[PDB]
Amino acid sequence: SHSMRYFSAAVSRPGRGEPRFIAMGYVDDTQFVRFDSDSASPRMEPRAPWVEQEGPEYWEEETRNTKAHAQTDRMNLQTLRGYYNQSEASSHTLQWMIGCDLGSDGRLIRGYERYAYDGKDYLALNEDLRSWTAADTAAQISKRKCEAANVAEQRRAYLEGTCVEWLHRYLENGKEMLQRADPPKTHVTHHPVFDYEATLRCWALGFYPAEIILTWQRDGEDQTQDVELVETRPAGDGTFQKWAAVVVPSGEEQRYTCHVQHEGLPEPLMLRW
């Protein structure tokens, strides 16, 4: 199962020139293009090997369209200051995402487009790709504007067409990197904790893609509560790490089993300390 997403963030800096703009693209968890207005010569640049086969006409158009985007979003920051009655004193952030998911197989499974202002949902294209959800009365203005301009019909055409076409291409081009499954290396650690208890921590390391399910069971029963599960984190080499921990009575450690599910495993692993 696979996805393409573009993201952008426009960040104002009062009295220090125009807002900063970044834009980036991903296939699954892999970044493949990036633009930063803070660069000496801002342009869309490659971030994965498999996109480097695209020619100069590609990079020039992506660059051209992203600069346009930057300028539009700098205006949008001004408009939103107006909607929310905000002064020129403080910095604000406007974030955007667009993308498409494939399941199996070939055509669009779900399209997305969404904006956030100052860290909160603002306006989103509904799953129907025909209507919009506004978070408040300011976003209701933007919605009415999107309706009058027939934006959804345009965005639907991109999502059902261009987005899916190019995701397919990148997945093929980057097939060795993007269509792989590297199973986690797993183990459990044990440490006493005070009051006749111990922490059992189940580790998963070096896996790709990031999706994984770590579950603790006592006596073969999934422990929902009381499990600490860390956020999946990058190793820095293109793989991921995660752990899950449970605190158990000393003398009862053997009654606990960790269960790891990942696409790269032939079958789910069970581990017991």
């Binding site: 590609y58 992203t66 504007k145």
Partner: peptide, 9 residues
């Protein structure tokens, strides 16, 4: 590939 158009809020 990015979309070609970006819209006004």
């Amino acid at each position: 590939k990015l979309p070609a158009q970006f819209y006004i809020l």
